[PDB]
Amino acid sequence: AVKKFKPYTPSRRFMTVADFSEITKTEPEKSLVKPLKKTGGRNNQGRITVRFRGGGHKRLYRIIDFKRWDKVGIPAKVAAIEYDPNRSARIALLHYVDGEKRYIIAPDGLQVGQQVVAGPDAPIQVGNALPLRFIPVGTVVHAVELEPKKGAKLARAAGTSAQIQGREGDYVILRLPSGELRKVHGECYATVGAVGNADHKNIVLGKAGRSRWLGRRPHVRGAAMNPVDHPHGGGEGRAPRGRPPASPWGWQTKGLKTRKRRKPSSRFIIAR
Amino acid sequence: MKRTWQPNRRKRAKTHGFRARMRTPGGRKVLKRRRQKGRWRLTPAVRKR
RNA sequence: CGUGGUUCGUGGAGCCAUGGGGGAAUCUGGGCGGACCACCGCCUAAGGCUAAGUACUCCGGGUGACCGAUAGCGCACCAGU
RNA sequence: GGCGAGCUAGCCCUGGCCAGGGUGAAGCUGGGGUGAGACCCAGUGGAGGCCCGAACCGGUGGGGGAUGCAAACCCCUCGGA
RNA sequence: UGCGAAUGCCGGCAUGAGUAACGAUAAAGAGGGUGAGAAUCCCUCUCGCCGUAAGCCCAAGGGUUCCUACGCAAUGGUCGUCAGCGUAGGGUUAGGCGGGACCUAAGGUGAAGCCGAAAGGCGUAGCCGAAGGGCAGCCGGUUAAUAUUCCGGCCCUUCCCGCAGGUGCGAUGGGGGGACGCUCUAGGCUAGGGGGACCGGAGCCAUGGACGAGCCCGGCCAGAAGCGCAGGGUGGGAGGUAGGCAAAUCCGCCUCCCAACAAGCUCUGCGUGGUGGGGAAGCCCGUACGGGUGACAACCCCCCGAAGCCAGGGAGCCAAGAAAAGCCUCUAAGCACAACCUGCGGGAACCCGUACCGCAAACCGACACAGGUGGGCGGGUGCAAGAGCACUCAGGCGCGCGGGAGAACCCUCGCCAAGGAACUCUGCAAGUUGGCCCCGUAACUUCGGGAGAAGGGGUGCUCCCUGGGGUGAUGAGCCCCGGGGAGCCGCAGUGAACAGGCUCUGGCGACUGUUUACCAAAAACACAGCUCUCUGCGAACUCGUAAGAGGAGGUAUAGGGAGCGACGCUUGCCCGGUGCCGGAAGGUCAAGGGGAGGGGUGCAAGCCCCGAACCGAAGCCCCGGUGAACGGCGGCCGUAACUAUAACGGUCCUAAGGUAGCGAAAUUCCUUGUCGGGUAAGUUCCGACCUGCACGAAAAGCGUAACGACCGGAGCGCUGUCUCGGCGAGGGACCCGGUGAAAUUGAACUGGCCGUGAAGAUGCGGCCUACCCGUGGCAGGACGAAAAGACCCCGUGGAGCUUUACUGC
RNA sequence: CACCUCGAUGUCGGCUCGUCGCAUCCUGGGGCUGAAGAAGGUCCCAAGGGUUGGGCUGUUCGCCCAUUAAAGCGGCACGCG
RNA sequence: UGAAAUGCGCAGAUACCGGGAGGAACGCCGAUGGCGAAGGCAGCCACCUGGUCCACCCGUGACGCUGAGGCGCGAAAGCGUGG
RNA sequence: CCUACGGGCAGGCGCCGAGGGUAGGGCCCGUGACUGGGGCGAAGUCGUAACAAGGUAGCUGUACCGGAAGGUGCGGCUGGAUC
RNA sequence: CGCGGGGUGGAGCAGCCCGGUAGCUCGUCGGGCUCAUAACCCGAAGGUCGUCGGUUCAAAUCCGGCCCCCGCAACCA
RNA sequence: UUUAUGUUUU
Ligand SMILES: NC[C@@H]1O[C@H](O[C@H]2[C@@H](O)[C@H](O[C@@H]3[C@@H](O)[C@H](N)C[C@H](N)[C@H]3O[C@H]3O[C@H](CO)[C@@H](O)[C@H](O)[C@H]3N)O[C@@H]2CO)[C@H](N)[C@@H](O)[C@@H]1O
Ligand SMILES: [Mg+2]
Ligand SMILES: [Mg+2]
Ligand SMILES: [Mg+2]
Ligand SMILES: [Mg+2]
Ligand SMILES: [Mg+2]
Ligand SMILES: [Mg+2]
Ligand SMILES: [Mg+2]
Ligand SMILES: [Mg+2]
Ligand SMILES: [Mg+2]
Ligand SMILES: [Mg+2]
Ligand SMILES: [Mg+2]
Ligand SMILES: [Mg+2]
Ligand SMILES: [Mg+2]
Ligand SMILES: [Mg+2]
Ligand SMILES: [Mg+2]
Ligand SMILES: [Mg+2]
Ligand SMILES: [Mg+2]
Ligand SMILES: [Mg+2]
Ligand SMILES: [Mg+2]
Ligand SMILES: [Mg+2]
Ligand SMILES: [Mg+2]
Ligand SMILES: [Mg+2]
Ligand SMILES: [Mg+2]
Ligand SMILES: [Mg+2]
Ligand SMILES: [Mg+2]
Ligand SMILES: [Mg+2]
Ligand SMILES: [Mg+2]
Ligand SMILES: [Mg+2]
Ligand SMILES: [Mg+2]
Ligand SMILES: [Mg+2]
Ligand SMILES: [Mg+2]
Ligand SMILES: [Mg+2]
Ligand SMILES: [Mg+2]
Ligand SMILES: [Mg+2]
Ligand SMILES: [Mg+2]
Ligand SMILES: [Mg+2]
Ligand SMILES: [Mg+2]
Ligand SMILES: [Mg+2]
Ligand SMILES: [Mg+2]
Ligand SMILES: [Mg+2]
Ligand SMILES: [Mg+2]
Ligand SMILES: [Mg+2]
Ligand SMILES: [Mg+2]
Ligand SMILES: [Mg+2]
Ligand SMILES: [Mg+2]
Ligand SMILES: [Mg+2]
Ligand SMILES: [Mg+2]
Ligand SMILES: [Mg+2]
Ligand SMILES: [Mg+2]
Ligand SMILES: [Mg+2]
Ligand SMILES: [Mg+2]
Ligand SMILES: [Mg+2]
Ligand SMILES: [Mg+2]
Ligand SMILES: [Mg+2]
Ligand SMILES: [Mg+2]
Ligand SMILES: [Mg+2]
Ligand SMILES: [Mg+2]
Ligand SMILES: [Mg+2]
Ligand SMILES: [Mg+2]
Ligand SMILES: [Mg+2]
Ligand SMILES: [Mg+2]
Ligand SMILES: [Mg+2]
Ligand SMILES: [Mg+2]
Ligand SMILES: [Mg+2]
Ligand SMILES: [Mg+2]
Ligand SMILES: [Mg+2]
Ligand SMILES: [Mg+2]
Ligand SMILES: [Mg+2]
Ligand SMILES: [Mg+2]
Ligand SMILES: [Mg+2]
Ligand SMILES: [Mg+2]
Ligand SMILES: [Mg+2]
Ligand SMILES: [Mg+2]
Ligand SMILES: [Mg+2]
Ligand SMILES: [Mg+2]
Ligand SMILES: [Mg+2]
Ligand SMILES: [Mg+2]
Ligand SMILES: [Mg+2]
Ligand SMILES: [Mg+2]
Ligand SMILES: [Mg+2]
Ligand SMILES: [Mg+2]
Ligand SMILES: [Mg+2]
Ligand SMILES: [Mg+2]
Ligand SMILES: [Mg+2]
Ligand SMILES: [Mg+2]
Ligand SMILES: [Mg+2]
Ligand SMILES: [Mg+2]
Ligand SMILES: [Mg+2]
Ligand SMILES: [Mg+2]
Ligand SMILES: [Mg+2]
Ligand SMILES: [Mg+2]
Ligand SMILES: [Mg+2]
Ligand SMILES: [Mg+2]
Ligand SMILES: [Mg+2]
Ligand SMILES: [Mg+2]
Ligand SMILES: [Mg+2]
Ligand SMILES: [Mg+2]
Ligand SMILES: [Mg+2]
Ligand SMILES: [Mg+2]
Ligand SMILES: [Mg+2]
Ligand SMILES: [Mg+2]
Ligand SMILES: [Mg+2]
Ligand SMILES: [Mg+2]
Ligand SMILES: [Mg+2]
Ligand SMILES: [Mg+2]
Ligand SMILES: [Mg+2]
Ligand SMILES: [Mg+2]
Ligand SMILES: [Mg+2]
Ligand SMILES: [Mg+2]
Ligand SMILES: [Mg+2]
Ligand SMILES: [Mg+2]
Ligand SMILES: [Mg+2]
Ligand SMILES: [Mg+2]
Ligand SMILES: [Mg+2]
Ligand SMILES: [Mg+2]
Ligand SMILES: [Mg+2]
Ligand SMILES: [Mg+2]
Ligand SMILES: [Mg+2]
Ligand SMILES: [Mg+2]
Ligand SMILES: [Mg+2]
Ligand SMILES: [Mg+2]
Ligand SMILES: [Mg+2]
Ligand SMILES: [Mg+2]
Ligand SMILES: [Mg+2]
Ligand SMILES: [Mg+2]
Ligand SMILES: [Mg+2]
Ligand SMILES: [Mg+2]
Ligand SMILES: [Mg+2]
Ligand SMILES: [Mg+2]
Ligand SMILES: [Mg+2]
Ligand SMILES: [Mg+2]
Ligand SMILES: [Mg+2]
Ligand SMILES: [Mg+2]
Ligand SMILES: [Mg+2]
Ligand SMILES: [Mg+2]
Ligand SMILES: [Mg+2]
Ligand SMILES: [Mg+2]
Ligand SMILES: [Mg+2]
Ligand SMILES: [Mg+2]
Ligand SMILES: [Mg+2]
Ligand SMILES: [Mg+2]
Ligand SMILES: [Mg+2]
Ligand SMILES: [Mg+2]
Ligand SMILES: [Mg+2]
Ligand SMILES: [Mg+2]
Ligand SMILES: [Mg+2]
Ligand SMILES: [Mg+2]
Ligand SMILES: [Mg+2]
Ligand SMILES: [Mg+2]
Ligand SMILES: [Mg+2]
Ligand SMILES: [Mg+2]
Ligand SMILES: [Mg+2]
Ligand SMILES: [Mg+2]
Ligand SMILES: [Mg+2]
Ligand SMILES: [Mg+2]
Ligand SMILES: [Mg+2]
Ligand SMILES: [Mg+2]
Ligand SMILES: [Mg+2]
Ligand SMILES: [Mg+2]
Ligand SMILES: [Mg+2]
Ligand SMILES: [Mg+2]
Ligand SMILES: [Mg+2]
Ligand SMILES: [Mg+2]
Ligand SMILES: [Mg+2]
Ligand SMILES: [Mg+2]
Ligand SMILES: [Mg+2]
Ligand SMILES: [Mg+2]
Ligand SMILES: [Mg+2]
Ligand SMILES: [Mg+2]
Ligand SMILES: [Mg+2]
Ligand SMILES: [Mg+2]
Ligand SMILES: [Mg+2]
Ligand SMILES: [Mg+2]
Ligand SMILES: [Mg+2]
Ligand SMILES: [Mg+2]
Ligand SMILES: [Mg+2]
Ligand SMILES: [Mg+2]
Ligand SMILES: [Mg+2]
Ligand SMILES: [Mg+2]
Ligand SMILES: [Mg+2]
Ligand SMILES: [Mg+2]
Ligand SMILES: [Mg+2]
Ligand SMILES: [Mg+2]
Ligand SMILES: [Mg+2]
Ligand SMILES: [Mg+2]
Ligand SMILES: [Mg+2]
Ligand SMILES: [Mg+2]
Ligand SMILES: [Mg+2]
Ligand SMILES: [Mg+2]
Ligand SMILES: [Mg+2]
Ligand SMILES: [Mg+2]
Ligand SMILES: [Mg+2]
Ligand SMILES: [Mg+2]
Ligand SMILES: [Mg+2]
Ligand SMILES: [Mg+2]
Ligand SMILES: [Mg+2]
Ligand SMILES: [Mg+2]
Ligand SMILES: [Mg+2]
Ligand SMILES: [Mg+2]
Ligand SMILES: [Mg+2]
Ligand SMILES: [Mg+2]
Ligand SMILES: [Mg+2]
Ligand SMILES: [Mg+2]
Ligand SMILES: [Mg+2]
Ligand SMILES: [Mg+2]
């Protein structure tokens, strides 16, 4: 669902919040596996390399399992579903029969107390991981490896997913959450299901502050600047751009393509 | 109203101190310059303990 | 091929050096005498060392058609205070 | 070529501070309502870049000060809290 | 090598001038003392001022300022016998407080490693790094000056050694734990406070009365074990085991079995506790203070009561809230006549800090500067509460020039007949309003608001009756909330202090918020939210020569860039140009390949040069697409059976000729457009029209409740704003004593008029007027002062910025 | 026009305070009248004094309301920061 | 298409074959038929589920009809959020 | 003051009270720059939507567009001519 | 009076550079189709080129003056 | 597959 609020202040009026009923007991997270401490800095060494960041709630890092082949054939029970502040998705805490503990990014529908496992063995029901080669064409799956053993990279975002479109040689063809068609090696793990908590896209920060809590500091338009600061600075009386719309550093920000032209990657693609 | 000097003994040593001068080659040169002029103090005097 | 050095700012541009590419020979070998060619000459690259004559004045000394306390060093005096 | 973020701006780690009033969201419990509901009413509850207002943070209008008490201050007033 | 000028440079001394000032308007008076000298030093008494401080205790920073003796040249805004000043002497005592022989944070540094012309930059571990974690001292007494430091009492820590008892002992390694948010909170306590008819106590009865259950003062502090009341923390067995980078008997997971409760086991807080310690007023002394007694002091009941403690308590919420060591456990080597554990005993416990100032005369501000500076304590009464306000304890102060006088004028205040915005750019300013309780409250609305709407009533004291709550008992007291009735007094009862004036109607911005430190707080920025665009992850993008890093330990519901800016209803047409996007052709196109063919020189083999076809990228050309990409979105002429006007037509151009909706507007030049409304009267304001100089749709269009120290218009209220001033107060001004500046200054023996003059004369001409010198006053002149005009030009001066200027990176 | 002034001659309007000119707005005295009277017109003399309060706009100025004997024009660095 | 033109196509179209992607609608059966209160409902399968008819003459005993308000359904277009 | 005085009267205070005042609401009527459409008025303008298949069958709810009638999309009705 | 563009049958546009002839759509007139009008078809008429002067052999055209028209400019002050 | 229209009153 989602939480709305009576307008008992302005901005409590438009504010929408996450529906946390999905979250099995939680409140304190799980030390041991996670958290580590999160070094919370907004710049590289010395200097700001990404604008308008900083502030926002102190945040512990749950350390999550992106290589499932790590324990093949060992099953595990889903102990809890918890809130993880470092991602849009939610994490499942799962107890292996080894008595080993891992967090997994929690797929849609995976429910507490269900057996989960990974390997080529791998029942094709939800929350299970397999090399892509053994997942049946047409199945919707998440947390893909882009190259084998390198760890899950694709479709980790709240409610994201990828479909398996076909197979070619040792590679299989995915349609990624973006709509790009990509070949990915067969030996790459993935995990059946979509990511879940897809209502994520519909929350409404509601007010200046809520954007601060998330570590997001005010973003100022070139238009509002001086020409020293930006292509769009100056003139005032406001102004149209007066040139092709640009970034602070001068490149065109409407339409100009970016991806490096000659890229080895380039040969495994096929879409938008 | 709050002025520019807000002395803090730890700052002063950590900033203009003898050891801080010796890391930076820029600083080793200050010491060299100061020493050659025969300044009685190569480094701001600081104190306590 | 790209540059530097020389008086040489591409110039007829050699010489010396060399970032890149190709890439030898050992006296009947190789470099040079200002593009190149012939002739005639000079010299032996791709290892190293080498006093003296030369430069300077923190330091000591001797001199002054040098100053003489607003001068002469910033400081003749407990001043790089 | 150095020296500066002991002022100021942003951020990072770690601590601290916000009298006292006011309004009374959700949710709960009960009651009614219905096929079941939506829902309505109470009571409880105690949310909010909510309200009033000290500390604290400000610097709105005016007056004064103008070789000042002050190289930005003082009084009255006012904004957040 | 000769100085008069350079707003020259260095110095000295003048001018203003005995002029301004002497630094908060909290405030002083007298008596005595000291002394060469006293408003200023000491002491007494009276008066005033702080008291969520202007009192007290920490931390910074300061670094002798501390205490005492002797001093007054200078410093002190006057004086000084005094001092934070001169001289000298003293003064800072810790196993337990802080910090270090502990830990880790950001960050720093950095074996390995990586990178860089050199300098150097990165960087895992490690190391450094604290107001965080960890760790054992409480009360009182002593000094002129230190005290959790010395002393006294009560109490603990670690290390070493030794005994006794116990156990597989053993770690930098495994595991537990340390360990964590915000808001709101429960129960019990403690600090703290108020009362007492009770206990203790010097004394006191005035001035009309009171010998009284009178007045006045005080009725505690710390304390091991044990004990009690609170509360925190924890399940206990067994079997399996493949995980916790070795190994675990530990932790983890699975299955059984007991408990489910704090029961227990603990650990804290509080109480009590052997004992130790304090202990008023007043009076007597002596100060320069402290000391005697009060005393064998008393030492108790009740109430209020934390934001503090039990603490890792609980509940709710989303934005989801350090680490490491100490600590416990597990095992590994090893070693097990070791070791470790517990108890007792003896010994052993180092380095630094410790004075004083610390909201300020001792710190930052050149100053004994009305500024600035973090944490804790901060009593009492009343006022709804409170840290607010008034008075006030403790404690601390009267601010380091005084005395008079009673002018103008200024500042800061108080009052005002009648009027009541007539003032003015404007109600600027100041008035009004003002707390609580109750009654009562409209448009509109996003149903929350708008609301403190508006507008009213009440408000003190007295006696009587009376309902609940907390402690106590189910009671008395003492607290706490009230309710009803009858009276009393004044002009007035939140009797002083703190404490909104209100309404209507536009513009801009949705809102809280942000900003030009020191002339702009806004309609500017930001903001949730909408769109576009980039980006498949060694992402784009940013910083860096690099290594590396941020992005992100993120992954398209994510991240960068850009516009727009809640929300509502919407956002039209043009792709010709520019940009971007697509385009396996074609045109052009550099090096390079290629060498038809030519040239130099040789006897020649040759060496050496040019060099046409042709094959050669991107880019440009070229073809398409694209508007929430840069952007653009017409002209003339005619036409209706009154006239007007033109639904209609003609023609010229264009890539397309502006849709809706707005419109004399934050836009309208003409302009105070015209009409309506408000007003006695309206260049503004409100509503219309549309002839829009020169609106128009995400440099958004048009609206919108709420919000606003924004900007406009109007009314009520009420006023010294004003007609139009008056009086009054205090700080100055003025006179006297003390101290005593400043810019400015060619020199001066420095008048008016009409002329003249480089065109605005004290300075020249003519005339006029005029004894010498001051003091308080006003500003017309000295083209008064200040700043080598910021405007303007000029200089082949400079700088920031722009681009389809040039040229480069 | 570019003469003093760019090592500074502060610039509109208001307010306060005036002072002066007369080419007189009122009041006093006059001639002429197409002056019956009353009331005007027009010129002459005359600068003694007087010359209102509001609405609008920053405005000067104008327009307007209500009055008046009248609501005068100018100069004084568009008098006077 | 009336005829055409715009458009598309030598940058290799149309026509043809193979492969893939995606969305929408269900030919024949199909009827002048069936179901539903209505709006409406059409490939196939499964699950959940409404109405309705017939046979038997077994059970209740008038428990019925209609129905202002109320409540629910309601083609197409249209609106909000996401696809 | 009068008494036939445990009284009456004058007089004083109080409740309520016509109304007046202040403040804010609700209903109705009149009127208003301007503005919207409507009715009606022999022979003005533009077109031709409808009536015959109306020369695109018509109508319809809705949506968008356009000087005007109207046009077009979606679904619906036959109140559609035609072999 | 600053700079730029313009004035051509009845309307709207060409033609002007570079000389010599004035062209397009509409409108007008005559005739057709029609019962009739318009549409439609076949024919025709109509301009000294704002104006005066100049240049040339010849001027809508090149040049100068004046009259009108449209657009832009009027800044620091 | 080119068409539109027919002044008012009897
Ligand atoms: N009642 C007529 C309503 O309005 C319109 O009708 C109005 C107009 O359309 C109509 O105007 C007509 C016009 O159509 C027609 N083509 C020309 C005719 N002369 C006009 O007539 C009109 O104008 C003249 C004045 O000259 C009047 O005298 C005459 O009465 C009047 N109807 O006159 C009507 C006013 O009465 C609609 N046609 C009609 O459907 C609607 O119901
Ligand atoms: Mg670093
Ligand atoms: Mg650094
Ligand atoms: Mg979102
Ligand atoms: Mg922004
Ligand atoms: Mg700007
Ligand atoms: Mg900059
Ligand atoms: Mg720029
Ligand atoms: Mg710009
Ligand atoms: Mg502008
Ligand atoms: Mg501050
Ligand atoms: Mg300084
Ligand atoms: Mg420090
Ligand atoms: Mg610091
Ligand atoms: Mg020395
Ligand atoms: Mg060279
Ligand atoms: Mg050259
Ligand atoms: Mg040459
Ligand atoms: Mg050369
Ligand atoms: Mg040679
Ligand atoms: Mg060479
Ligand atoms: Mg080479
Ligand atoms: Mg040889
Ligand atoms: Mg040679
Ligand atoms: Mg030669
Ligand atoms: Mg060569
Ligand atoms: Mg040689
Ligand atoms: Mg020497
Ligand atoms: Mg001499
Ligand atoms: Mg000297
Ligand atoms: Mg000297
Ligand atoms: Mg001398
Ligand atoms: Mg020397
Ligand atoms: Mg010197
Ligand atoms: Mg010396
Ligand atoms: Mg530098
Ligand atoms: Mg700083
Ligand atoms: Mg800021
Ligand atoms: Mg506090
Ligand atoms: Mg119920
Ligand atoms: Mg608030
Ligand atoms: Mg407030
Ligand atoms: Mg202010
Ligand atoms: Mg101000
Ligand atoms: Mg002022
Ligand atoms: Mg002044
Ligand atoms: Mg001299
Ligand atoms: Mg001279
Ligand atoms: Mg001189
Ligand atoms: Mg004087
Ligand atoms: Mg004086
Ligand atoms: Mg004085
Ligand atoms: Mg005396
Ligand atoms: Mg004596
Ligand atoms: Mg005295
Ligand atoms: Mg200190
Ligand atoms: Mg000293
Ligand atoms: Mg002292
Ligand atoms: Mg002295
Ligand atoms: Mg003295
Ligand atoms: Mg003195
Ligand atoms: Mg002083
Ligand atoms: Mg003395
Ligand atoms: Mg001393
Ligand atoms: Mg001790
Ligand atoms: Mg201490
Ligand atoms: Mg310690
Ligand atoms: Mg040691
Ligand atoms: Mg450490
Ligand atoms: Mg480093
Ligand atoms: Mg290094
Ligand atoms: Mg510490
Ligand atoms: Mg600590
Ligand atoms: Mg300690
Ligand atoms: Mg103790
Ligand atoms: Mg003590
Ligand atoms: Mg905690
Ligand atoms: Mg409590
Ligand atoms: Mg007491
Ligand atoms: Mg007596
Ligand atoms: Mg007695
Ligand atoms: Mg006590
Ligand atoms: Mg076992
Ligand atoms: Mg193991
Ligand atoms: Mg609190
Ligand atoms: Mg606690
Ligand atoms: Mg808790
Ligand atoms: Mg360690
Ligand atoms: Mg063990
Ligand atoms: Mg062993
Ligand atoms: Mg001490
Ligand atoms: Mg102190
Ligand atoms: Mg202070
Ligand atoms: Mg303090
Ligand atoms: Mg001070
Ligand atoms: Mg002091
Ligand atoms: Mg002082
Ligand atoms: Mg000071
Ligand atoms: Mg403070
Ligand atoms: Mg109060
Ligand atoms: Mg308190
Ligand atoms: Mg106070
Ligand atoms: Mg006192
Ligand atoms: Mg003083
Ligand atoms: Mg009075
Ligand atoms: Mg008055
Ligand atoms: Mg009034
Ligand atoms: Mg106003
Ligand atoms: Mg103003
Ligand atoms: Mg005001
Ligand atoms: Mg009420
Ligand atoms: Mg309300
Ligand atoms: Mg009220
Ligand atoms: Mg009252
Ligand atoms: Mg009273
Ligand atoms: Mg009770
Ligand atoms: Mg009462
Ligand atoms: Mg009061
Ligand atoms: Mg008040
Ligand atoms: Mg108030
Ligand atoms: Mg705002
Ligand atoms: Mg605000
Ligand atoms: Mg400012
Ligand atoms: Mg500034
Ligand atoms: Mg200001
Ligand atoms: Mg503001
Ligand atoms: Mg300001
Ligand atoms: Mg960097
Ligand atoms: Mg780079
Ligand atoms: Mg990199
Ligand atoms: Mg990275
Ligand atoms: Mg990361
Ligand atoms: Mg904007
Ligand atoms: Mg648009
Ligand atoms: Mg359009
Ligand atoms: Mg169009
Ligand atoms: Mg275009
Ligand atoms: Mg195009
Ligand atoms: Mg284009
Ligand atoms: Mg071809
Ligand atoms: Mg090509
Ligand atoms: Mg070539
Ligand atoms: Mg070649
Ligand atoms: Mg190409
Ligand atoms: Mg193409
Ligand atoms: Mg354009
Ligand atoms: Mg007509
Ligand atoms: Mg007619
Ligand atoms: Mg037309
Ligand atoms: Mg108007
Ligand atoms: Mg405009
Ligand atoms: Mg205005
Ligand atoms: Mg208006
Ligand atoms: Mg326009
Ligand atoms: Mg605009
Ligand atoms: Mg736009
Ligand atoms: Mg906007
Ligand atoms: Mg608007
Ligand atoms: Mg504001
Ligand atoms: Mg006054
Ligand atoms: Mg006075
Ligand atoms: Mg003259
Ligand atoms: Mg003169
Ligand atoms: Mg003369
Ligand atoms: Mg004199
Ligand atoms: Mg005088
Ligand atoms: Mg003067
Ligand atoms: Mg001057
Ligand atoms: Mg100058
Ligand atoms: Mg210049
Ligand atoms: Mg230049
Ligand atoms: Mg001149
Ligand atoms: Mg001068
Ligand atoms: Mg006269
Ligand atoms: Mg005259
Ligand atoms: Mg007269
Ligand atoms: Mg007469
Ligand atoms: Mg005004
Ligand atoms: Mg005017
Ligand atoms: Mg003038
Ligand atoms: Mg003037
Ligand atoms: Mg003025
Ligand atoms: Mg073709
Ligand atoms: Mg049927
Ligand atoms: Mg039907
Ligand atoms: Mg069925
Ligand atoms: Mg039967
Ligand atoms: Mg029966
Ligand atoms: Mg009814
Ligand atoms: Mg429907
Ligand atoms: Mg539909
Ligand atoms: Mg009544
Ligand atoms: Mg028709
Ligand atoms: Mg039709
Ligand atoms: Mg037709
Ligand atoms: Mg039809
Ligand atoms: Mg029909
Ligand atoms: Mg329309
Ligand atoms: Mg039209
Ligand atoms: Mg139907
Ligand atoms: Mg033309
Ligand atoms: Mg032409
Ligand atoms: Mg001619
Ligand atoms: Mg300019
Ligand atoms: Mg017609
Ligand atoms: Mg007819």
Tab-separated table of C-alpha atoms (C1' of nucleotides) and ligand atoms in Angstrom, chain A residues 44-49, chain E residues 121-122 542-544 546-549, ligand 128:
chain	number	residue	atom	x	y	z
A	44	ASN	CA	36.786	12.148	-2.929
A	45	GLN	CA	40.101	13.081	-1.435
A	46	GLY	CA	39.758	16.711	-0.443
A	47	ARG	CA	37.164	17.755	-2.887
A	48	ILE	CA	33.540	17.684	-3.917
A	49	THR	CA	33.125	15.342	-6.871
E	121	G	C1'	50.700	11.809	-4.745
E	122	C	C1'	48.010	7.566	-3.355
E	542	U	C1'	33.286	14.882	-11.299
E	543	C	C1'	38.619	15.710	-8.960
E	544	G	C1'	43.508	14.115	-10.314
E	546	A	C1'	48.907	9.571	-12.942
E	547	A	C1'	47.970	5.941	-9.130
E	548	G	C1'	43.696	6.688	-7.038
E	549	A	C1'	39.107	8.520	-5.364
K	128	MG	MG	41.342	15.063	-5.850
